[PDB]
Design an enzyme around this catalytic site. Sequence first.
Site, short mmCIF file in Angstrom:
data_model
loop_
_atom_site.label_atom_id
_atom_site.label_comp_id
_atom_site.label_asym_id
_atom_site.label_seq_id
_atom_site.Cartn_x
_atom_site.Cartn_y
_atom_site.Cartn_z
N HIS A 247 6.84 -5.87 10.34
CA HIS A 247 6.25 -5.88 8.99
C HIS A 247 7.23 -5.34 7.95
O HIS A 247 7.10 -5.76 6.81
CB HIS A 247 4.98 -5.02 9.02
CG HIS A 247 4.24 -5.05 7.74
ND1 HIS A 247 3.58 -6.18 7.32
CD2 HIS A 247 4.06 -4.12 6.79
CE1 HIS A 247 3.01 -5.94 6.16
NE2 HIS A 247 3.30 -4.69 5.82
N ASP B 221 4.78 -9.09 13.40
CA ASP B 221 4.02 -8.29 12.46
C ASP B 221 2.71 -7.83 13.10
O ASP B 221 1.91 -8.66 13.54
CB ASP B 221 3.74 -9.09 11.19
CG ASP B 221 3.41 -8.20 10.00
OD1 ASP B 221 2.67 -7.22 10.17
OD2 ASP B 221 3.89 -8.51 8.88
N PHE C 243 0.82 -1.20 0.00
CA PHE C 243 0.00 0.00 0.00
C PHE C 243 0.86 1.26 0.00
O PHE C 243 1.77 1.40 0.82
CB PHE C 243 -0.92 -0.01 1.22
CG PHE C 243 -2.22 0.72 1.03
CD1 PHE C 243 -3.06 0.41 -0.02
CD2 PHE C 243 -2.60 1.72 1.91
CE1 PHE C 243 -4.26 1.08 -0.19
CE2 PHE C 243 -3.79 2.39 1.75
CZ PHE C 243 -4.62 2.07 0.70
N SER D 221 3.40 -7.43 1.73
CA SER D 221 2.14 -6.96 2.31
C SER D 221 1.04 -7.12 1.27
O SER D 221 0.77 -8.27 0.86
CB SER D 221 2.33 -5.54 2.84
OG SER D 221 1.37 -5.23 3.83
N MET D 222 0.38 -6.05 0.82
CA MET D 222 -0.68 -6.19 -0.17
C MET D 222 -0.15 -6.75 -1.49
O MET D 222 -0.88 -7.43 -2.21
CB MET D 222 -1.37 -4.85 -0.41
CG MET D 222 -2.45 -4.51 0.60
SD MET D 222 -3.24 -2.94 0.21
CE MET D 222 -4.68 -2.99 1.27
N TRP E 241 -0.68 -9.49 2.99
CA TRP E 241 -1.92 -8.96 3.54
C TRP E 241 -3.04 -9.19 2.54
O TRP E 241 -2.87 -8.95 1.34
CB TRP E 241 -1.79 -7.47 3.86
CG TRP E 241 -2.97 -6.91 4.59
CD1 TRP E 241 -3.08 -6.73 5.94
CD2 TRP E 241 -4.21 -6.47 4.03
NE1 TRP E 241 -4.31 -6.20 6.25
CE2 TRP E 241 -5.02 -6.03 5.09
CE3 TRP E 241 -4.71 -6.40 2.72
CZ2 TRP E 241 -6.31 -5.53 4.89
CZ3 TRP E 241 -5.99 -5.90 2.53
CH2 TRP E 241 -6.77 -5.47 3.61
#
Length: 257
Positions: free
Chosen positions: A207, A175, A61, A129-130, A154
């Site tokens: 993270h 995380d 993100f 992550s994303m 994520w």
Amino acid sequence: NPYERGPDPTESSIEAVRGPFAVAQTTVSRLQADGFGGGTIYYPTDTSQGTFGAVAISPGFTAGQESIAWLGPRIASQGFVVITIDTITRLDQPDSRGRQLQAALDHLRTNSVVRNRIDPNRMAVMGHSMGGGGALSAAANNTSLEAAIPLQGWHTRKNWSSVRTPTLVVGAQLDTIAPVSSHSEAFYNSLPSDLDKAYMELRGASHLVSNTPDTTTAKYSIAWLKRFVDDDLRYEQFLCPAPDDFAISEYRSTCPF
Ligand SMILES: O=C(O)c1ccc(C(=O)NCCO)cc1
């Protein structure tokens, strides 16, 4: 195995910042890119051993290329064509991120400087992550992909029983942004129990572990890409059984593969 590249691996070799293959890089502008926001393609210059597999890596993100840039040359120096991508918008969600990863892969099929250096039938996806959730969505939408590695991924989607691609789930023990309990471990558990998969938990990690050179993250990501994008049985020694690293807090696999 005709896809084997480079000398036999050791612990030091998979840990090296740059492997044997000298690397070069080309840029794909935002306009040049159909289906993603551009990126940088890292590739080995030595073509004498043949073509290489392809890997696409997505950021998270509001993140850009430089959060994951260090993975491009590090992985490519082992014998891979690696494109680190920018997303179309900074707010793109994990499902969109999996498409931009597939479009970045497809763009490699027709990229002028690289398409003679690529085996288009052996491709893998990665992400933080994303972007890691996107890497799972790209596998859940392309059963021909050879490897998938979400790094502290994520995703609101917890059930991944449709992935047929050998997947390495790299979670961070500490995380909070995407805790492994409701994310990474939930991804590994819902993957097919017969799939060649592995969950690796980095000890004491936040993270942000993937946003800076992390040797543990690099060595196992290389082993996975070798064993699965190159079917290189020489790298199974590093995955089966559990690695002896203090950096790893937890580990579960479907070894032997
Ligand atoms: O990239 C970030 O900073 C970030 C993005 C999304 C969230 C979030 O809302 N996730 C909740 C689901 O666990 C948190 C942080």
